[PDB]
């Protein structure tokens, strides 16, 4: 096994490239879907750099990414947005004010949820090292969605990232009581992100089904899995 410092540095270097996109209901959804597809390509590359991921069975790798992709997109959005109250920084040159959610049916509720969760991370003063850990924990199925060598390996990988998160928190020097509460709050926020993801995917599928936006390629493949 790697040390926790070694694991966190591995997560840092795995970070994906940033993407650039390029309103009506159609044009906002077109931008957002084009963005997601671009990010998804890079997400797969990112997952492959997480220690142990490519040692899992191909089926587990597929099922993990199918399960978490929207959560991973969303936590990245929250991190990009953390220091800008009332704004969602989807990408450079796609910075949306809360009120621009009025452009798309049903999207404002989702924006408000994403902004509220971002605000909780801001209040917690989420650290760089914590962000890295929690994004990897999401991929490695800290939610425990039902998907033996591969399952045993996955448990080991998830435990390793959790250990690294505990280590990061321990470096803050706050009381053991406060360290435990912080970990609880972070895990409960990840559970909340899962719920927002479920809502977001339902909304995307609705926009597809109503022919508000076409969905192609990798995003289509990941959406079809839901």
């Amino acid at each position: 096994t790697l040390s926790p410092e070694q694991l966190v540095l591995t997560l840092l270097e795995a970070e994906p490239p940033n993407v650039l996109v390029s309103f009506t209901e159609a044009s906002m959804m077109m931008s957002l879907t084009k963005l997601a597809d671009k990010e998804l390509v890079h997400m797969i590359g990112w997952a492959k750099k997480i220690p142990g991921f490519v040692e899992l069975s191909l089926l587990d790798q597929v099922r993990l990414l199918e399960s978490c992709w929207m959560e991973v997109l969303m936590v990245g959005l929250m991190w990009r947005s953390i220091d800008h109250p009332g704004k969602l920084i989807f990408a450079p040159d796609l910075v949306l004010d809360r009120d621009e959610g009025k452009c798309v049916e049903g999207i404002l509720e989702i924006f408000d949820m994403l902004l509220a969760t971002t605000s909780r991370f801001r209040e917690l003063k989420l650290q760089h090292k914590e962000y890295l850990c929690v994004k990897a924990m999401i991929l490695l199925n800290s939610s425990m969605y039902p998907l033996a060598e591969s399952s045993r390996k996955l448990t080991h990988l998830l435990n390793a990232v959790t250990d690294a998160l505990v280590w990061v928190i321990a470096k803050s020097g706050i009381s053991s009581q406060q360290q435990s509460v912080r970990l609880a709050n972070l895990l409960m926020l990840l559970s909340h992100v899962r719920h927002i993801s479920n809502k977001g995917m339902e909304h995307l599928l609705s926009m597809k089904c109503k022919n508000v936006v076409p969905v192609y390629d990798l995003l289509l493949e990941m959406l079809n899995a839901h």
Partner: peptide, 9 residues
Amino acid sequence: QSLINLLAD
């Protein structure tokens, strides 16, 4: 490229 091709690439 599809999910599988991206994973196997």
